[PDB]
Symmetry: D2
Subunit: 268 residues, 4 copies
């Protein structure tokens, strides 16, 4: 209700999906929230619906959009307390031979270097407020994922970069943490499934990947982000898993293209 | 303020230290808190100071004290929503040749089997409320600690048991999570340091073990416990680090009894 | 062929399964191997087949069998270079309400305290040879397993205790490491499956739990143990996964008793 | 001696340091080793000294040097069994405000995309031999490092990409693993220390970061690489730590620029 009252928070990719759930969660905690998104439609709708949230058109891959975002946030609101690096993209499934260096580079621009660029420009102001940084990584950065070599690499980089930043910024009292969601039901998840030959079978497999038996919601990642910013004052460099237990226990991992012998020869 | 309002919460070892900070944090969230402690003095003081907290004398190593704790909590309050297994002990430093099987067993009774016994008796009621279990483990369960083989083993067991329980209880919607604190300034920490030849040098070394440059507070573990119980509905089987970054980066690890060559032979 | 030539190695539970594969692997490397097992049949067969391997009847839960094992190994062979703590048991599936404290204690005696007791008595001799300790833990110590709360706890304890020992013993140059196998086709695995209503379906599910699409073999854990003892001179406190990738990627984790909604409500 | 006899192995950055130790280790195991390095001097010396090792001038950041490397390896030797992606660079210490996007990109080209490019072109031939990939990551990819945000990110990416590749390639039986060294005494380590105001104090701090009390040697990473290629047939997607225990236990983590209170206020 007031656990982050009056703090200024920038959320990239805040126009829909997990980012919108983060935006709403910080607004509910009393923060001034600057929505950064390359897409005007969702951000403008959130800005008009939510007082306390304002929208600034900004592509995190463009160094000058991020410089203007930072310049305007300070110019209009006087401080910066929290940066949530959520803007990111997951390509459709691609085998390694179906990936290109050019595509990998483009994905690093958004998923990693957008996060790096905003953080670097935000730090001189976060140091002044003893603010904090929250990166939205992914569970697959930690455990891998099939048909997603470029995406998995960008998220492995984000999680590692979070720890290096935590070390670099701890002398100023600036905490740097990441959230690693598993399967969260979002427009991105829906758009990816709709590319499959059986979208709802894909969605059901995504639900069965969790011991809890469902996907997560954006509001649940949002609650984790407000916790990290407002009540985790002894946490830095941590990776907070919001995954429904997907990393626990044994499961069916041999793919449908993987030769598997009958169970009379169990170990080759 | 009301994020866990009316839920019934049992906290073992709640009379002082981290447990008291957990008790206060749940009371602040609106819960009915049953303080379990073998020591009457601290629990009675908390119970008299805090309405909403009641004290029940209980040694978690005694199966009948735990059975009576559970029987009385239901008998008096009608439900059980959350169990926080915090009761635990850290022995003074002991080299491996200075440990005994008898001492190891006694430590397993408190640190592991007390946690197991209460959880087992609580589950039939937690299943009915879709409640959750929170175990207080330790960072050293994950990274080890010098001169603490028995203690480190009990906490490794608690963290692993948390994940097995999460898998066993997810079909009922019961979440099971643990918090792994690093260095938290508590009466236990103070009593251990006071056994050293230079207690404040020991305390200062405990502060320098964190990039943040201080130890944590019980209230910070308490905020993490209320988060897990009340707002982490997609988290199960996680290990939430409350460590001030102590696990990050390189540090001075070669002990004062460890032969180290001069830097003209860096790799042997 | 000679990578561990003349070193003296004790292997508990070496009469069959993973332990026998470890015994054979060290014999192949040139070691004198002392087979410790409570079962005479398998150890005597290995001792008669393999010169270099000798069998000593020994139950690791009995402090005096372990004291006599150690006393006889030195008395007969003059040194001790390596201890492989492999003796362990996995109970049939048991829900948490189907476990007892008495059964948990008995399992801690074998899986944890047997490992502790031998290590403690072996260390004064390992310190003299700059030898090393290898503990056989389990992947489920790290990621959990359904219907195995006591077993998972003992293996979490072993992995953690390995790191504490590594810290305590590094000033003597004694390395302490563990191997965490996933699904290894052994007599134990076969006996557990044979208790299921469809044993070969269970075995097939055990094979499909790995991206590689099969279970491991004892010889593969054996090759990992000889590596740790003979060529990993900069490794201590590590957990070497021999799992076929079972911990990677998403899989089917929602159990057959877990209510799962249809895919039109993916996140509750 | 013959544990990898006749297999063809490509090692990038094999002209000195860890790569040279990997080259020598595979040559000792009987392999045909193709040394890839941008620097002619070290590779030519290894090629002339070691029969079985041949040198091919190749910059892994240049797609056509890697295409020619692959084309020539097959053209000259008929098969490809193992790729060791070792070529990498660690910049001098740099605070985050002292880094540039342009420098970050250049470092991603070498440390990540060089590894990606060679792997992609090698896979059609590794699939035919059921070969394997070994990536040389770094412990700091897992735990972070001060003043190295770009470097730490590239190594986090490599470790994650290793797991995604392991999942993508397991249906062909191709294993993909990484080694994460800690402090290894190499020419790179020496050149970085020589940039410090007190190089040998820096080297000594690098030695004290390990419980073992020394840095590792290239030959020790080399032994780990031959193990992964030749005897770890049930290992895929693993991260093999060669760190001397640097990740274990508590150490001095508060930096010399970090305000730390006196020990009479231990937790703020
Ligand atoms: N959905 C999941 O299951 C899941 C799982 C793990 C991690 N994540 C991560 O969470 C984040 C959000 O995912 P989502 O599922 O909510 O996705 P989404 O596609 O639903 O929303 C992402 C938002 O970011 C914006 N955005 C994209 N590129 C941008 C750019 N260049 N500059 C500024 N804004 C940009 C989009 O316009 C959109 O509003 C991503 O980083 C994603 O990788 C998602
Ligand atoms: N203090 C730290 O730095 C630290 C770090 C990591 C983990 N932990 C863990 O946190 C927990 C609490 O630690 P603390 O520092 O607050 O300790 P503490 O000694 O300050 O308080 C522990 C409380 O538990 C009670 N207790 C002990 N044995 C009991 C028993 N048999 N039955 C019931 N109650 C019993 C004690 O009377 C006391 O009130 C422990 O499990 C400890 O291992 C502490
Ligand atoms: N098989 C797997 O898939 C698997 C997976 C992970 C870990 N492990 C672990 O590997 C180890 C060996 O497992 P396995 O599958 O080879 O089992 P196993 O039952 O096939 O063989 C275990 C051996 O240990 C001996 N032993 C048992 N109790 C003993 C005692 N008290 N004293 C001395 N010897 C004793 C038995 O007689 C037997 O010879 C165990 O610690 C087990 O938990 C096995
Ligand atoms: N030395 C350590 O303590 C340490 C620790 C962790 C990880 N590592 C990693 O191990 C690897 C080797 O490190 P090192 O200490 O042996 O370094 P090094 O500088 O001693 O040797 C690296 C070699 O790679 C070559 N190389 C560099 N750029 C290249 C390019 N574009 N194309 C082809 N070859 C190229 C260099 O010419 C050199 O021969 C790197 O990936 C490094 O990040 C090293
Ligand atoms: Cl996957
Ligand atoms: Cl320690
Ligand atoms: Cl399981
Ligand atoms: Cl560091």
């Amino acid at each position: 209700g007031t656990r982050y009252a009056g703090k200024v928070v920038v959320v990239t990719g805040g126009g829909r999906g997990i980012g919108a759930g983060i935006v709403r969660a910080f607004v509910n905690s009393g923060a001034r929230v600057v929505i950064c998104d390359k897409d005007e439609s969702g951000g403008r709708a959130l800005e008009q619906e939510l007082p306390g949230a304002v929208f600034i058109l900004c592509d995190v891959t463009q160094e000058d959009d991020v410089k203007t975002l930072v310049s305007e946030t300070i110019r209009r609101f006087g401080r910066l307390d929290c940066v949530v690096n959520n803007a990111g993209h997951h390509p459709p499934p691609q085998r390694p031979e179906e990936t290109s260096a050019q595509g990998f580079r483009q994905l690093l621009e958004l998923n990693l270097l957008g996060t790096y660029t905003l953080t670097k420009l935000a730090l001189p102001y976060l140091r002044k407020s003893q603010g904090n940084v929250i990166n939205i990584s992914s569970l697959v950065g930690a455990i891998g994922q099939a048909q997603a070599v470029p995406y998995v690499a960008t998220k492995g980089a984000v999680t590692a970069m979070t720890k290096a930043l935590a070390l670099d910024e701890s002398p100023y009292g600036v905490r740097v943490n990441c959230i690693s969601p598993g399967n969260i039901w979002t427009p991105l998840w829906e758009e990816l499934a709709a590319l499959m030959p059986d979208p709802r079978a894909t969605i059901r497999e995504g639900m069965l990947a969790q011991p809890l038996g469902r996907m997560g919601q954006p509001a649940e990642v949002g609650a984790a982000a407000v916790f990290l910013a407002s009540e985790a004052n002894f946490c830095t460099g941590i990776e907070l898993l919001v995954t429904g237990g997907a990393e626990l226990g044994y499961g069916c991992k041999a793919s449908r293209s993987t030769p598997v012998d009958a169970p009379d020869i169990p170990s080759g």
